[PDB]
Design a protein around this ligand. Sequence first.
Ligand SMILES: CCCCCCCCCO[C@@H]1O[C@H](CO)[C@@H](O)[C@H](O)[C@H]1O
Ligand SMILES: CCCCCCCCCO[C@@H]1O[C@H](CO)[C@@H](O)[C@H](O)[C@H]1O
Ligand SMILES: NC(=[NH2+])NCCC[C@H](N)C(=O)O
Ligand SMILES: NC(=[NH2+])NCCC[C@H](N)C(=O)O
Lengths: 423, 423
Amino acid sequence: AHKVGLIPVTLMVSGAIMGSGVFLLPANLASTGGIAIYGWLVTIIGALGLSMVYAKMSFLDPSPGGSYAYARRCFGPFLGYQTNVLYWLACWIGNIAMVVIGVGYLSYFFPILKDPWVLTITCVVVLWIFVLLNIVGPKMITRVQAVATVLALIPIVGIAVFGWFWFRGETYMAAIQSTLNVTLWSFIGVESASVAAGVVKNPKRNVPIATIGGVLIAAVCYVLSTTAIMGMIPNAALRVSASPFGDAARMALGDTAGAIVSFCAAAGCLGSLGGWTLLAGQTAKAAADDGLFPPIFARVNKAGTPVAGLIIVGILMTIFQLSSISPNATKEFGLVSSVSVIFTLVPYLYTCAALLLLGHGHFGKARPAYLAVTTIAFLYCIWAVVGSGAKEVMWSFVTLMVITAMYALNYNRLHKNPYPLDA
Amino acid sequence: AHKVGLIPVTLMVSGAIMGSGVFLLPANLASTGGIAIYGWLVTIIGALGLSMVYAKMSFLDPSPGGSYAYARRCFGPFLGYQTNVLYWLACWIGNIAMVVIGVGYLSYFFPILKDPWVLTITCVVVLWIFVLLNIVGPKMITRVQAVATVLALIPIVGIAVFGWFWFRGETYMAAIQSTLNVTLWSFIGVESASVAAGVVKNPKRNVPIATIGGVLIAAVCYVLSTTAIMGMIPNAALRVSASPFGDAARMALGDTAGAIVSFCAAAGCLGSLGGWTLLAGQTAKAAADDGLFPPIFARVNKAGTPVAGLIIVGILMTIFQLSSISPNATKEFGLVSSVSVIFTLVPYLYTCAALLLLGHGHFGKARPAYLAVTTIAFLYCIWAVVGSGAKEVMWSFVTLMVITAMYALNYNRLHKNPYPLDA
Ligand SMILES: CCCCCCCCCO[C@@H]1O[C@H](CO)[C@@H](O)[C@H](O)[C@H]1O
Ligand SMILES: CCCCCCCCCO[C@@H]1O[C@H](CO)[C@@H](O)[C@H](O)[C@H]1O
Ligand SMILES: NC(=[NH2+])NCCC[C@H](N)C(=O)O
Ligand SMILES: NC(=[NH2+])NCCC[C@H](N)C(=O)O
């Protein structure tokens, strides 16, 4: 019936940011290399800045759930409304990618998991298992995310520690498109604790610490595993198709790296979606409470868990999953990953705008930065949009319009304009 | 020192919507035909609806300048800020296309106007001439726009009246991309009177009448000239390259149609940009007055004309014109026309949202529509975005972020949040 403690929360943030990314990014990145690494560097810096922004903002205002709340204070109910619809959509839509991936990893052990049918079925089942777990509660979901991420660090920490022996000279000059997709994706999760603040005991101290702790851990692992791989698989080796990560895996860990890796990968991927289901429920609840989403989303139980909220998300998730637009259908991760990333960027951007419009004054002698630090978060949000696909940036731009019109229609009486008419 | 009268205003709206479009659209449209006509039909219907929306909204609130004001009341200063930055940008950027076009038309008479140098030079000069005219005033700019559009109707009205004799059977089944560009472009201008309300005597009566009058006239001419051409140039004739409009022109008007047409075309194109320079100055002034743009834009003279405002716009226009991104450089109208159109759509969309959030109550027994009529305006805005280019929709999406961040940075103290902090 109560909230969650620092360590578990901070591991949740670390895990929001990893799960899929840790194993996808370093492989991918080493593989293509060169121009790609700069991109990676840029987005690392941007994520670190954005994290300071969130840290500071959740500090100022320990409200649930993250950017939704900040955008509502900062601008209107309308920007609140919109921020949540976007972020909410992003959380669960992204799950459609992660189930297919994290269950793919276990195909190593259960060959049958590669018949599309079994894959799809097994996928829906796992989605609902994590819905159930969330219904059990934040404590249950968080404990599982915790064990899951640490498990996923075994292989990352391992390759790092034993890649030092094989560490050498670095070919840094040497497709860039889709790596950019993966790299942008791999650093979403910065905002998680801030969004899940309503469900963390002592938000004001715990959340800012948690987000920086989490980002810091995640930043460290990404850089270490990445440099490690670039250093230990040769430049002429880069070529070897289907190689990349797995190569470093076996050479640094034995001929059981297969099992260990495709286990901790799966571990980090699933149970990370446990956390994203959670987060989806939290924005929606946060918003429904203010009357900026339908009220069923605000409907909680004893512990204050939006069970109907989470159940719905389970339903939507499985409709989408069984749809033709799903990775199970298309065998493609670009659409889902892309909208998932871009729908997060608007919340990011409003959060930055929020820090300044809300927390000027609370800056004092340390003002620029913040100013500096946050125009960096701004430039990263822009960077990410510009580096995303045009089709998908357009689909998000359309979604903005649909959301606008939909608020107009669904809230027309009872809105309360900032500068009303008369008569 | 004073304002403008119905007839002139309503001709301005008619001319905002034509100038370039009347001669570009019907040609183009007949040429490609088929699927293209449906697109045309859709956008006609959407523009008619959007016009009812603007008519009703300027009625409710006869404020300057249009959607900027409505968005400010409806949502925050921030949505006000953004609506204006977008619409303001659109007005003058679009001018870069129109000068090159409308001066092109006079190349018929002055062959030299086809050396790129002379073309460019002549272009900047004409831009400034219309800046001057605006500085003389709204009355001067409007009178010129008036004579200009009526002149441009001579050829349209003519082809219509004498295309009835040649009217026959219609091949309606038969690239679609760029026609869609032209058709979307050709119906921008609906919002003009509403934006130029601050400078029209008796806004509340005059403006709603003006916008419907203007749209109505424009709607009529587009449909008449278009059906006329489709009916009088044969299906096998459709092919004939460089033909299209000119064919119908000569066959319905003599072997001087060349002069008459490339004169009234030029007429409608230039002096339409007189009106767009005006409109640019009006949004900026409207906004600067509320402290949502720099104050120089609010700086008026005796008659209350933002001379520095308009001069600046002249400067920006000529920087852009002499830039590599200009039609003088690229020989292409897609970029400029596209951003010009998409930057208008967000103002449209917020205006629709505004009508409902502001004017519920003032609907009474006639409520749905409005509801109906305005979800149509909504669907048209979405339609236009979706039918635009992905690159350019993305550039507009980025611009949104730049505008957001820029408001954050430039207004952080003094903003006044809807739900502030403490301490
Ligand atoms: C309620 C949980 C189970 C409901 C769904 C049962 C599995 C449906 C089959 O899956 C799909 O079958 C298509 C037909 O071959 C494949 O083309 C596709 O790859 C695969 O995605
Ligand atoms: C202040 C008004 C006049 C200032 C600008 C003078 C004209 C500059 C030349 O124009 C440009 O010259 C380029 C070089 O050839 C061409 O490639 C291009 O097509 C054309 O756009
Ligand atoms: N459902 C989601 N929105 N997931 C986002 C995942 C992003 C994260 N950086 C990862 O690699 O896993
Ligand atoms: N500068 C501008 N924004 N011009 C818009 C022009 C659109 C109008 N429908 C036309 O055909 O001329």
